[PDB]
Design an enzyme around this catalytic site. Sequence first.
Site, PDB file in Angstrom:
ATOM      1  N   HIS A 222      18.399  73.067  36.258  1.00 10.54           N
ATOM      2  CA  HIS A 222      17.269  73.810  35.973  1.00 10.54           C
ATOM      3  C   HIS A 222      17.535  75.041  35.513  1.00 10.54           C
ATOM      4  O   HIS A 222      17.217  75.800  34.681  1.00 10.54           O
ATOM      5  CB  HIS A 222      16.145  73.865  37.124  1.00 10.54           C
ATOM      6  CG  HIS A 222      14.929  74.392  36.680  1.00 10.54           C
ATOM      7  ND1 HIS A 222      13.732  73.675  36.929  1.00 10.54           N
ATOM      8  CD2 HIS A 222      14.739  75.814  36.370  1.00 10.54           C
ATOM      9  CE1 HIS A 222      12.676  74.621  36.457  1.00 10.54           C
ATOM     10  NE2 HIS A 222      13.253  75.694  36.207  1.00 10.54           N
ATOM     11  N   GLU A 223      18.378  75.940  36.465  1.00  9.10           N
ATOM     12  CA  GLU A 223      18.939  77.283  36.281  1.00  9.10           C
ATOM     13  C   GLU A 223      20.069  77.522  35.206  1.00  9.10           C
ATOM     14  O   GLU A 223      20.088  78.466  34.747  1.00  9.10           O
ATOM     15  CB  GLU A 223      19.670  77.681  37.464  1.00  9.10           C
ATOM     16  CG  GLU A 223      19.093  79.036  38.246  1.00  9.10           C
ATOM     17  CD  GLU A 223      17.476  78.933  38.256  1.00  9.10           C
ATOM     18  OE1 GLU A 223      16.944  78.112  38.859  1.00  9.10           O
ATOM     19  OE2 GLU A 223      16.987  79.790  37.563  1.00  9.10           O
ATOM     20  N   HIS A 226      18.393  77.537  31.927  1.00  6.70           N
ATOM     21  CA  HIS A 226      17.937  78.815  31.605  1.00  6.70           C
ATOM     22  C   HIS A 226      19.023  79.537  31.121  1.00  6.70           C
ATOM     23  O   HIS A 226      18.925  80.472  30.070  1.00  6.70           O
ATOM     24  CB  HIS A 226      17.309  79.313  32.978  1.00  6.70           C
ATOM     25  CG  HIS A 226      15.983  79.107  33.161  1.00  6.70           C
ATOM     26  ND1 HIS A 226      15.245  79.694  32.133  1.00  6.70           N
ATOM     27  CD2 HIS A 226      15.136  78.598  34.148  1.00  6.70           C
ATOM     28  CE1 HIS A 226      13.943  79.251  32.490  1.00  6.70           C
ATOM     29  NE2 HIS A 226      14.059  78.822  33.854  1.00  6.70           N
ATOM     30  N   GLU A 261       9.198  79.128  31.736  1.00  4.19           N
ATOM     31  CA  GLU A 261       9.223  78.340  32.964  1.00  4.19           C
ATOM     32  C   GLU A 261       8.667  77.142  32.542  1.00  4.19           C
ATOM     33  O   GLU A 261       9.170  76.146  33.286  1.00  4.19           O
ATOM     34  CB  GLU A 261       8.574  79.277  33.961  1.00  4.19           C
ATOM     35  CG  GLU A 261       9.038  78.713  35.520  1.00  4.19           C
ATOM     36  CD  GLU A 261      10.715  78.883  35.334  1.00  4.19           C
ATOM     37  OE1 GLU A 261      11.073  79.895  35.348  1.00  4.19           O
ATOM     38  OE2 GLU A 261      11.055  77.775  35.474  1.00  4.19           O
TER      39      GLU A 261
HETATM   40 ZN   LIG Z   1      13.314  78.302  36.434  1.00  4.40          ZN
END
Ligand SMILES: [Zn+2]
Length: 1277
Positions: A222-223, A226, A261
Site C-alpha cells: 500500500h505504501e 504511494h 487515499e
Molecule cells: Zn495510504
Amino acid sequence: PFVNKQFNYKDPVNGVDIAYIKIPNVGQMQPVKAFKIHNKIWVIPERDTFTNPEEGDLNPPPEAKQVPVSYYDSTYLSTDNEKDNYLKGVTKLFERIYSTDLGRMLLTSIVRGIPFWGGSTIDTELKVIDTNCINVIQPDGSYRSEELNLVIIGPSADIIQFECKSFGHEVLNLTRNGYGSTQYIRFSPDFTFGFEESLEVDTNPLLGAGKFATDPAVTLAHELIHAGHRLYGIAINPNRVFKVNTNAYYEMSGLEVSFEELRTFGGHDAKFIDSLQENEFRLYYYNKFKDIASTLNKAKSIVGTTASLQYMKNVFKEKYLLSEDTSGKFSVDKLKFDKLYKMLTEIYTEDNFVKFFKVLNRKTYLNFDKAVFKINIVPKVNYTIYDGFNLRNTNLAANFNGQNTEINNMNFTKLKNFTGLFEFYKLLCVRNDLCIKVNNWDLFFSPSEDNFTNDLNKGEEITSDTNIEAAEENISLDLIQQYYLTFNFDNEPENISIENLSSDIIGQLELMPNIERFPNGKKYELDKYTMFHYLRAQEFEHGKSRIALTNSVNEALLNPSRVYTFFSSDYVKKVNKATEAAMFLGWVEQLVYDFTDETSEVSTTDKIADITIIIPYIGPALNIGNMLYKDDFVGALIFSGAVILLEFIPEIAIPVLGTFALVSYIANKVLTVQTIDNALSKRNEKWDEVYKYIVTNWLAKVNTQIDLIRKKMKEALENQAEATKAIINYQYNQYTEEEKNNINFNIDDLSSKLNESINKAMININKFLNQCSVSYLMNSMIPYGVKRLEDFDASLKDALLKYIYDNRGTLIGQVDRLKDKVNNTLSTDIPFQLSKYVDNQRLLSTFTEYIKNIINTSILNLRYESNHLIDLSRYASKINIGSKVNFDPIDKNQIQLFNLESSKIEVILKNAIVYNSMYENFSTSFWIRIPKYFNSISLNNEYTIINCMENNSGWKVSLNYGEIIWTLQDTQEIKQRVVFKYSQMINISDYINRWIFVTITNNRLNNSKIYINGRLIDQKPISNLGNIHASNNIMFKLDGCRDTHRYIWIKYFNLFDKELNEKEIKDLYDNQSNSGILKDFWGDYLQYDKPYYMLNLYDPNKYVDVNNVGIRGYMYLKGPRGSVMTTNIYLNSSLYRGTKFIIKKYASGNKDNIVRNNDRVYINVVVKNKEYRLATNASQAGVEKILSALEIPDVGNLSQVVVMKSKNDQGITNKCKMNLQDNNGNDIGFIGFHQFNNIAKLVASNWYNRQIERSSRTLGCSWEFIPVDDGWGERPL
Ligand SMILES: [Zn+2]
C-alpha cells in the site's frame, strides 16, 4: 525487489550497498548506517528521527492523537539485534511483493521512477536536485554523492503510523507536477493492525474466531503504491479531501480521507470519486508530462555527471513512456499516456494486491482498525514468502486461520492500544438523563454533498468528427495479465556517478496539510432510543459482577447487570433459571439449539418480489424499525422499503440534462449522415454518464451505511453469544466439584458452536442487506437519473428528425432509413447493467435475481400489503383512498368500487420521477370482476373506471354493456380506442361476473393491443397519434354510470414502462393466478364451510341430485337445468340449481378457510336442510364407485377423504378437482358421473386419474363450484 545478497546488521561497512549514509536532513546529522537492498532502494533500520526536526521525541503525548489506533514504545528498534530483525523483515516482504505478477511490475516502475532532473540551472540545462540523492560515507573516510529512489526508515513516535515522506522544493511540487522525488517510507514489519470480517462468511462458512490480522505485505504494498505516485509526480493534492458532515448524533465527529487515499486503496472506495473530478486529474497530469517533454526537448547541456545528455534524456524517456522521432524530439502520446497513468493509478492498488496475495484483508479504507499486534515474520515457521501466515499444510490455510489472531494465537501478541476506548466520542442522551459514550470511530460516515461534482448540464455541439465513447474496463485480472505481458522487464537505470554534493545536503520535508484537532464530548439529547443505545444494552460489565440475567427493555442498561436481547422470551427464561448439575448438558444442548434456532429465522415473503429473504429480529436488535406504525418490522420494511434502514437519506441531484447542438453540412452527405450517428452515439454514451454517476452516489451515501449495519448486527449477535456464555458460565462456575463428570462443559467448544450458529446467521442477514442496497438503488435513485435521460432522449429525437428534414435532398436516398434509425433508437431506453460499474460478485449476483422478476420493473405496482394499499414500486407519493371503497375481507387485495362518488382511489406519482414522454410505449394490466348487466339503462352507457388525463391526456379505461375499452388520445384530441366485447346471451360465459386478467400494450411506433386472459383480442394502429401528456395522477372511480347499482372489482393493478410481449404477458398472467389455491366459478379462493352448487363442465345442462339418502341410495345428474333471462339483455343457463356441496376441513385446519391445491377434505352433501356425507364403498364391483350421501355418524371406515386439486400431477391446470381416496391412503379416483342404464349416477372412477395424466380434455370430472353472488342477480329457488 528480489534483493541479491542476504544482509546482517553487523556486516562491515563497505562504501557500497552497505555504508554510512548521510540522508538529506536539516542542520547537521551524524551519519546513519543503511543497506542497499537493490538498485536505488536503501534501508535504514533507525526510527525516523532525522527527517523531521520536530519529531526527535519518541515518547507518547500527554494528549492522544485522534486516530482509532496508535502505539508507542520509546525503546523499539534500539538494540543492534532489533535492527537486524528489522532488516530481515523489510526484505522478506519485498520478496513477498516481488513474488507476485502485480508485485513484480510495481517494483520495476518504482526503481524506474527516478526524480526528473529539475534543479533549473538555466532553462536549457539539466541538473540534479540534491535533495534527491544521499551522501555515502566510504571506508577511507571519503564520500561520494549518490542518486536515490526510495528509502525505508523505521517509524517515528507512533510505531504504527506508516506513511510516505518526501523533501520539497523551494518552488516546485515535485510530487504533483510530474517530476517525482525520492521517497522515505516510514514503515515497520514488527506490528500490524487487527480487523474484523463480516462478509467472507458467504464463501468461508467456518470463518475465524474474531479479529483478524493484516498481512504486512499488503501494508507495505500500500505504501509503495504511494511512492509510485510520487516518484512519477502524480500524487493528488492532499488538499483534496472527501468532505464529511459532522453535526448529527449519528455522524462521525471527524475524519478526512484524501482522494489520493481513496485512489490508492482501489476497490469501491476509489469509485467514490466522480467522473468529472477523475478526468480533471488526468488532463492535469497529462499536461505535466507534456511540459516534461518540452523541458527535455530544449535541453542543450547537462551539468553534473559524466553521463551523456542523451543517456539522461533517455532515462526520462523510458520513465514517462515518451515517444521520440529520428531527430530525437519528444512528445506525449495521449493514448500511450492513458495507459501508463491507468497503471500507476488503477492496476497498482491495495485491493488488486489482495487478489495476488490470497489473504483476507479490509474491503474498504473506511473500515477502521481496532487493534495492534506484535508479530515476528522472520522465522519460516511463522510467515513464509509464498503463504505468509496461512502456511501450507498447517491447519492455517482453510479459512485464513493463519490470519486469525485467536486461532493462530501463537503468532499475534495483543499489545496495548494507546487510544483508550472513549477518547474521541459523542454523548447521546435519551429524552435519569440516560446518555452513552459512543466512540467516534463507531459512528456513520456521511459524505458531504460537495464531494460529488457533476457537470452533466453542459450542452454540446456535435460535429461530424466528434470522438465516440470508451469502455470502462473494470481492471480484471485478465487486463492485468495483458499489462504484464506487454510489460518491459529488462534494463534498469545505471548507477550514474554524479559529482559530489555538499557534505551536508540541506533538507526540509514537503509540507502536509495541518491536523485540525476535532471537538470532543459533544452532547446529544435525543427523543427516541438510538441503534447505539440498543446495541450498548447488550454488552454487560466484564465478569466480576453478579450472575447477570438476560432481560428485554432498554432499561436493561441501568442495572450493573445490564443486558438486553432481541430473542423470544422463552430463551430469556431457559437462560435465566438455576439448573441442577445433575441436569446441565441438557440445558447446553437446549440453549445452543434455541440459539441456532432464533438466530436463523428468515421470512420468505414470496408474495413480495424485491426483497425476498428477511431477518425480522433486526428491527428489535438495532431498533431499526425506526419506530413506525408500532412494531412489526417485517411489515414495517414492506410498507416503506429499504429506506427504514438508512441512518440518513441521501439525495440525488441530476440536473436538467443539456442538449446536443447539431453542426450542419452544406450538400455533404457523408459528413452529414455521419453527424447524426455521432449524435445518436454520444447520446448512448450520454446515458452511461448518468448511470455511472448515480452508482458513485449510491456507493458512498447508501451502500456504506448498509455495511455499517452489516457490522452492527454482527456485533449484536456476538453480544448475545457472549452473555449466553456468561450466564451458562456463572452456573458451572458454582459447579458440584466432581471431576470426571462430563467431558468438560468446554466453554472453548460451546463457543466453537455458537460461532457457527452466528456465522450462518450472518449469511442470511447479509443476503437480506444486499437486497436492501441493490433494491434501494433501483427504485429510489435510478428512476430520477432516468427521467432526465428519457427527457433528453425525447428532445434529441425532435432535434434529430428536424436535422434530417432540414438536410433532405442531400440525404436523398436515405431520408427515410435515417428517419427510421433515429426514431427506432430513441424509442427505447438504455438498460442499466450493474456489471458495467461494479465487479462485486456479491451485489451483481443480487442485481441479477432482481432483474429476473419483471415485476420489480413496473413503474407502479400496488397490492394490499400488511395493512395498507401501497405502491411497492415506490413510485407513488400519495395514495388517497375513498370512504366507500371496500376491500374483500379474504384477499383484501381485491378492491370493489361502487357508483358512489365517495368510493374512489386516486394515485399521484412523484413528479420528479415522472417524465412526460412516459406513455408513448407502455403497458397496463389488472384483474377485473364485472357484475352482470340486468337493466336496459346499462345498454349504450359507457362509464369510465380508470382515468389518467391532463386535458386530452390519453388512456382511460371505460366500460359499456358487455365490452371493455381502452382509449388513447393526444392533446390534438385525436383519439384511438381498442375494444373487447363479450356477449351476454350465452349458456355459460367466461367473463360474466367473473375475474378477467387484462393487459393493454402501447407502442408509439405501432399499435395498441388488448389482451384478455393472456390471448390477444384486438389491436389498432397508433403510428398516427400525436404527442401525449403524462398525467401526474391516476384515478380509480367509475364515471358516468347511469346505473345506480353498478360496481366493479379490480385487482393487481400494474403499470409497465415498456411494451410487454406475448411471452411476458402469459408469464405475468400465470403468475397472478394463484394456482396453489382452488377457485370459485367466479374466481375467488374456494372455501371451507361454504355451500356451493355443482356445475359439471362436461354436461352443463344437468344438475346434481341425491336420488335417495343412504348406501342403498345414490347421486346422479338430474334433468334439464333451467334457463334465466330478461329479454334484450341476457339469456344464461341457470346456475344456482340442484343439491349444494359443502367442503369440510380434515388436514391442517383452524388456519384460513381457503382451500389449497393439495388438501385432504370432506364433502358434505346438503339434503333437505340436512347435511350428509358423500362416501362410497371401495369394495364395489367395477372401476366406477357410485357414491352415496351417508349419515355422518354411519360412515365409518368407508372411503370419504377427498384430495382437492388445482394443478395436475405434471403441473398443468385441470378442472378435475375431487379425487376420492380409501383410508389406506390409496386412490379410488376422481369424482365424475357415469351412465348406469340411462341414469348417470355420480361416480368415483380411476379412469380420469389415468386420462388427466395423458391429455387435458375437459372430462366428466370437470367440476365447478358455484356460490351465490350479488353479481348473478339470480334468485336461489
Ligand atoms: Zn495510504
